[PDB]
PDB file of C-alpha atoms in Angstrom:
ATOM      1  CA  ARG A   7     -31.601  -7.975  -6.171  1.00 17.38           C
ATOM      2  CA  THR A   8     -28.085  -6.695  -4.609  1.00 15.67           C
ATOM      3  CA  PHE A   9     -25.141  -8.746  -4.608  1.00 16.29           C
ATOM      4  CA  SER A  10     -21.932  -9.176  -2.052  1.00 16.62           C
ATOM      5  CA  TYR A  11     -18.552 -10.818  -1.712  1.00 18.90           C
ATOM      6  CA  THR A  12     -16.025 -11.352   1.055  1.00 18.30           C
ATOM      7  CA  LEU A  13     -11.904 -12.721  -0.073  1.00 18.08           C
ATOM      8  CA  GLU A  14     -11.465 -13.692   3.368  1.00 17.92           C
ATOM      9  CA  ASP A  15      -7.653 -14.381   2.558  1.00 15.36           C
ATOM     10  CA  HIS A  16      -7.438 -10.867   1.627  1.00 16.62           C
ATOM     11  CA  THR A  17      -6.105  -9.285   4.400  1.00 14.81           C
ATOM     12  CA  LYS A  18      -3.544 -11.479   4.767  1.00 10.90           C
ATOM     13  CA  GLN A  19      -2.573 -11.658   1.105  1.00 10.87           C
ATOM     14  CA  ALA A  20      -2.135  -7.688   1.473  1.00 10.13           C
ATOM     15  CA  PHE A  21      -0.126  -7.769   4.318  1.00  8.87           C
ATOM     16  CA  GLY A  22       1.943 -10.008   2.626  1.00  9.20           C
ATOM     17  CA  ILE A  23       2.468  -7.117  -0.183  1.00 10.47           C
ATOM     18  CA  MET A  24       3.083  -4.396   2.239  1.00  9.77           C
ATOM     19  CA  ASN A  25       5.986  -6.641   4.578  1.00  9.82           C
ATOM     20  CA  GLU A  26       7.503  -6.950   0.616  1.00  6.00           C
ATOM     21  CA  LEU A  27       7.614  -3.231   0.314  1.00  3.97           C
ATOM     22  CA  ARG A  28       8.755  -2.603   3.540  1.00  2.00           C
ATOM     23  CA  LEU A  29      11.936  -4.849   3.144  1.00  2.00           C
ATOM     24  CA  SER A  30      12.311  -3.170  -0.482  1.00  2.00           C
ATOM     25  CA  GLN A  31      12.249   0.213   1.253  1.00  2.00           C
ATOM     26  CA  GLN A  32       9.250   1.457  -0.754  1.00  2.00           C
ATOM     27  CA  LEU A  33       6.528   3.794  -0.234  1.00  2.00           C
ATOM     28  CA  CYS A  34       8.068   4.041   3.619  1.00  2.00           C
ATOM     29  CA  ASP A  35       7.531   7.514   4.777  1.00  2.00           C
ATOM     30  CA  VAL A  36       8.869   6.895   8.554  1.00  2.00           C
ATOM     31  CA  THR A  37      12.721   5.499   9.559  1.00  2.00           C
ATOM     32  CA  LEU A  38      12.879   4.834  13.324  1.00  2.00           C
ATOM     33  CA  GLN A  39      16.437   5.713  14.763  1.00  3.85           C
ATOM     34  CA  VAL A  40      16.690   3.516  17.801  1.00  6.45           C
ATOM     35  CA  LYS A  41      19.496   3.654  19.836  1.00  5.35           C
ATOM     36  CA  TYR A  42      19.767   1.754  23.434  1.00  8.13           C
ATOM     37  CA  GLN A  43      22.575   1.743  25.889  1.00  9.22           C
ATOM     38  CA  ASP A  44      25.794   0.677  24.065  1.00  6.54           C
ATOM     39  CA  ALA A  45      24.292  -1.252  21.850  1.00  6.87           C
ATOM     40  CA  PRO A  46      25.058   0.297  18.565  1.00  6.44           C
ATOM     41  CA  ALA A  47      22.409   2.343  16.711  1.00  5.56           C
ATOM     42  CA  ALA A  48      20.066   0.586  13.976  1.00  6.04           C
ATOM     43  CA  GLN A  49      17.351   2.454  11.879  1.00  5.35           C
ATOM     44  CA  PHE A  50      13.670   0.402  10.566  1.00  7.34           C
ATOM     45  CA  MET A  51      12.130   2.091   7.672  1.00  9.88           C
ATOM     46  CA  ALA A  52       8.167   1.710   7.828  1.00 11.26           C
ATOM     47  CA  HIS A  53       4.676   2.987   6.679  1.00 11.49           C
ATOM     48  CA  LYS A  54       3.535   5.078   9.620  1.00  8.33           C
ATOM     49  CA  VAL A  55      -0.296   3.821   8.477  1.00  6.96           C
ATOM     50  CA  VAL A  56       0.985   0.061   9.365  1.00  4.82           C
ATOM     51  CA  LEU A  57       2.111   1.166  12.513  1.00  6.09           C
ATOM     52  CA  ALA A  58      -0.491   3.110  13.526  1.00  7.28           C
ATOM     53  CA  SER A  59      -2.969  -0.264  12.425  1.00  2.00           C
ATOM     54  CA  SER A  60      -1.176  -2.237  15.679  1.00  2.00           C
ATOM     55  CA  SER A  61      -0.417   0.328  17.908  1.00  2.00           C
ATOM     56  CA  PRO A  62      -2.529   2.929  19.672  1.00  2.00           C
ATOM     57  CA  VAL A  63       0.990   4.666  20.485  1.00  2.00           C
ATOM     58  CA  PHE A  64       2.314   4.990  17.189  1.00  2.00           C
ATOM     59  CA  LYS A  65      -1.007   5.622  16.162  1.00  2.00           C
ATOM     60  CA  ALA A  66      -1.143   8.646  18.597  1.00  2.00           C
ATOM     61  CA  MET A  67       2.533   9.800  17.539  1.00  2.00           C
ATOM     62  CA  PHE A  68       1.793  10.329  13.303  1.00  2.00           C
ATOM     63  CA  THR A  69      -1.946  11.584  13.914  1.00  2.00           C
ATOM     64  CA  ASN A  70      -1.036  15.262  14.648  1.00  2.00           C
ATOM     65  CA  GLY A  71      -3.295  16.877  12.027  1.00  2.00           C
ATOM     66  CA  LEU A  72      -0.526  18.534  10.196  1.00  2.00           C
ATOM     67  CA  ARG A  73       1.878  15.701   8.579  1.00  2.00           C
ATOM     68  CA  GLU A  74       5.032  16.423   6.880  1.00  2.00           C
ATOM     69  CA  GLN A  75       6.385  15.899   3.854  1.00  2.00           C
ATOM     70  CA  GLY A  76       7.422  12.380   3.643  1.00  2.00           C
ATOM     71  CA  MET A  77      10.017  10.631   5.397  1.00  2.00           C
ATOM     72  CA  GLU A  78      10.006  11.612   9.448  1.00  2.00           C
ATOM     73  CA  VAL A  79      12.903  10.299  11.725  1.00  2.00           C
ATOM     74  CA  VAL A  80      11.601   9.122  14.996  1.00  2.00           C
ATOM     75  CA  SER A  81      14.169   8.564  17.942  1.00  2.00           C
ATOM     76  CA  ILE A  82      13.441   5.532  19.908  1.00  2.00           C
ATOM     77  CA  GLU A  83      14.851   4.731  23.345  1.00  2.00           C
ATOM     78  CA  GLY A  84      14.979   2.320  26.471  1.00  2.00           C
ATOM     79  CA  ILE A  85      13.705  -0.549  23.959  1.00  2.00           C
ATOM     80  CA  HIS A  86      16.800  -2.861  22.490  1.00  2.00           C
ATOM     81  CA  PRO A  87      16.924  -2.747  18.590  1.00  2.00           C
ATOM     82  CA  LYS A  88      16.702  -6.691  18.400  1.00  2.00           C
ATOM     83  CA  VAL A  89      12.750  -6.312  19.759  1.00  2.00           C
ATOM     84  CA  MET A  90      11.867  -2.746  17.891  1.00  2.00           C
ATOM     85  CA  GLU A  91      12.758  -5.253  14.787  1.00  2.00           C
ATOM     86  CA  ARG A  92      10.803  -8.266  15.966  1.00  2.00           C
ATOM     87  CA  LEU A  93       7.663  -5.667  17.097  1.00  2.00           C
ATOM     88  CA  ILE A  94       7.861  -3.844  13.736  1.00  2.00           C
ATOM     89  CA  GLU A  95       7.496  -7.466  12.144  1.00  2.00           C
ATOM     90  CA  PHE A  96       4.839  -8.653  14.439  1.00  2.00           C
ATOM     91  CA  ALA A  97       2.749  -5.578  12.940  1.00  2.00           C
ATOM     92  CA  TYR A  98       3.604  -6.586   9.406  1.00  2.00           C
ATOM     93  CA  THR A  99       3.217 -10.482   9.322  1.00  2.00           C
ATOM     94  CA  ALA A 100       0.768 -11.291  12.928  1.00  2.00           C
ATOM     95  CA  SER A 101       3.422 -13.492  14.049  1.00  2.00           C
ATOM     96  CA  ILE A 102       6.434 -13.015  16.782  1.00  2.00           C
ATOM     97  CA  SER A 103       9.262 -14.957  17.614  1.00  2.00           C
ATOM     98  CA  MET A 104      12.101 -15.092  20.171  1.00  2.00           C
ATOM     99  CA  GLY A 105      14.300 -17.191  22.537  1.00  2.00           C
ATOM    100  CA  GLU A 106      13.163 -18.365  25.728  1.00  2.00           C
ATOM    101  CA  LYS A 107      15.080 -15.363  27.129  1.00  2.00           C
ATOM    102  CA  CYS A 108      14.583 -12.576  25.192  1.00  2.00           C
ATOM    103  CA  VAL A 109      10.458 -12.841  26.105  1.00  2.00           C
ATOM    104  CA  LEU A 110      10.269 -10.305  29.082  1.00  2.00           C
ATOM    105  CA  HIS A 111      12.316  -7.918  26.922  1.00  2.00           C
ATOM    106  CA  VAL A 112       9.880  -8.195  23.943  1.00  2.00           C
ATOM    107  CA  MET A 113       7.108  -8.062  26.384  1.00  2.00           C
ATOM    108  CA  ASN A 114       8.731  -4.649  27.859  1.00  2.00           C
ATOM    109  CA  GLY A 115       8.443  -3.118  24.378  1.00  2.00           C
ATOM    110  CA  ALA A 116       4.878  -4.221  23.438  1.00  2.00           C
ATOM    111  CA  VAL A 117       3.676  -2.589  26.824  1.00  2.00           C
ATOM    112  CA  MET A 118       5.389   0.403  25.931  1.00  2.00           C
ATOM    113  CA  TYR A 119       3.568   0.520  22.429  1.00  2.00           C
ATOM    114  CA  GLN A 120       0.266  -1.170  23.666  1.00  2.00           C
ATOM    115  CA  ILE A 121       0.287  -4.020  21.388  1.00  2.00           C
ATOM    116  CA  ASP A 122      -2.017  -5.437  23.383  1.00  2.00           C
ATOM    117  CA  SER A 123      -1.984  -9.219  21.743  1.00  2.00           C
ATOM    118  CA  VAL A 124       2.009 -10.085  22.255  1.00  2.00           C
ATOM    119  CA  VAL A 125       1.590  -8.374  25.865  1.00  2.00           C
ATOM    120  CA  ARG A 126      -0.808 -11.264  26.230  1.00  2.00           C
ATOM    121  CA  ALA A 127       0.845 -14.043  24.989  1.00  2.00           C
ATOM    122  CA  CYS A 128       4.295 -12.967  26.360  1.00  2.00           C
ATOM    123  CA  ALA A 129       2.480 -13.388  29.653  1.00  2.00           C
ATOM    124  CA  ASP A 130       0.873 -16.696  29.085  1.00  2.00           C
ATOM    125  CA  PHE A 131       4.411 -18.020  28.440  1.00  2.00           C
ATOM    126  CA  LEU A 132       6.072 -16.277  31.275  1.00  2.00           C
ATOM    127  CA  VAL A 133       3.221 -17.723  33.756  1.00  2.00           C
ATOM    128  CA  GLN A 134       3.858 -21.279  31.904  1.00  2.00           C
ATOM    129  CA  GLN A 135       7.449 -21.212  32.896  1.00  2.00           C
ATOM    130  CA  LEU A 136       6.221 -21.324  36.066  1.00  2.00           C
TER     131      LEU A 136
END
């Protein structure tokens, strides 16, 4: 006779640890350098495999069948640092939070990164405001 087991909380617990490693800057292999209009420059370190798991655009950007030695710097354009921050957090935690009046900027960043679940959620909000 065979024998299976599934831990239902596993992926949640594991993303908990991945987020701690991001915040401690351990095992990170990408730095996103975000410059937007005249807002001050910001950097966010991350794990390519986690970004790729949440965004088809990151996935295509990092999958070039001939990956670098370690730490890639990526220049990002036309998205505000706070918006990037919240999308990175979403990728690592499955949750996003914003004031009523950032929701459009967030949707703008989410479309650009093809993070479809948050595009949908923000679209729902905006329509309810009518």
